[PDB]
Amino acid sequence: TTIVALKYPGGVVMAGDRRSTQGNMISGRDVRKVYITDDYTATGIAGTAAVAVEFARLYAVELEHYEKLEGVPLTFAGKINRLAIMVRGNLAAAMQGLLALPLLAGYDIHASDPQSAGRIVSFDAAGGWNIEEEGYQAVGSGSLFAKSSMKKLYSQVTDGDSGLRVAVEALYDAADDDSATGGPDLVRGIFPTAVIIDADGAVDVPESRIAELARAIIESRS
Template identity: 25%
Template sequence: MPGLSFDNFQRNSFLAAKGYPVPKATSTGTTIVGCRFDGGVVIAADTRATEGDIVADKNCEKLHRISPSIWCAGAGTAADCEFVTQLMSSTLELHALSTGRAPRVVTCLTLLKQHLFKYQGHIGAYLIVAGVDATGPRLFSIHAHGSTDVGYYLSLGSGSMAAMAVLETNWKETLTKDEAMTLCASAIEAGIWNDLGSGSNVDMCVMEVDKPAVLYRNYRTPNVRATKEKSYLFAKGTTSVLSTKIRPIVKTVPYDIFEEAVVKDDDKMEVDS
């Protein structure tokens, strides 16, 4: 059936009347993307961190290292993304030491979704996991409730719609590394310009088969602060002084000053005052 469907409006109104409030929309305030190419995978993110309507950090890091060949981009609650990825990094390192083999991307995906599913979305981590292993380049996304997706290009965060428009328009089956990097950077910039929760710079990480991962910090800086047209420092005397009044300090409570010194001799100790 063409057009939008509002069938759930009556259902939500009925549940609200019974005491079940309608859940509010949550903005993660981020744009993260991932894209596969011939022989590798690219992930990218913006660098704006927000606290409600306030920009808390203009150049934060949203790309997290899990293993030498596995990285992830995080959207949602900053602390949750940071500590969840640190936990997975430690877990995968122990797994690699136990098995004697390099960890696979799908292993990281399984551990992450099992961990997030236990908390039923209360850990606000929305992740794009990417890397290369024995099976080749892999790209996955994980939502806070534990659901996962797999694809050749992915996007999450409040700016994901703007980024996805760029990805769907310019993606093709045979991408080179440079084309994938340009595509991901352009998708992040679309989120920066069209989403208030995204902004500042573009960070990027490139993972290729049989090569170490390369992190490009501030790969693009589209929001460089411009020089002010004029100085806003006013010369002394610009604002006139209308009146001056000097109030002397008056002692309202009488007080005396005492000084004590302890003098120590060989045979006695006395206090002089």
């Protein structure tokens, strides 16, 4: 797997590949790893599939639960803390092979500067969290290739569309070097998934635009 998240002026973007493996064997081609966990938050998990899906579902439920009980959504800090506590809860099973690392991306409606209200948070198997203050981050077996690619491409990010394009390119490179990360499949028409978040909330990026960006990248490297 590879999940990528990067900040652009006024919002944030997260993308994920579609591949699922059992050792060397390909067990899935269209798995959706990026979830809209609330109006201003998207979560993307890598690792054991059962644990990842459970993480996304339970997490979303917990946030909305607090929102309905208290009539107000948690602060972003509280969201980070809840996610980390959940990851720490699974540490023993993670030692037994059921490991799942999430990557958090959101838009903080209470931050001071609305242009820099975008947020990207990494986690580790111990439940330690770190807010990324350098614009992008990745997680999964291709996360280093995606981070080194974004390190070079990030200067092209000036708005939503350029940020989305750099995210899809970083997923392209991750898949280029990591056999556990699926690239674009032109035969079947399956492309990475994406969520973008700004002042109006978190929305699913349409498949078509991601496909145009992918084909452009492909034709550019030929």
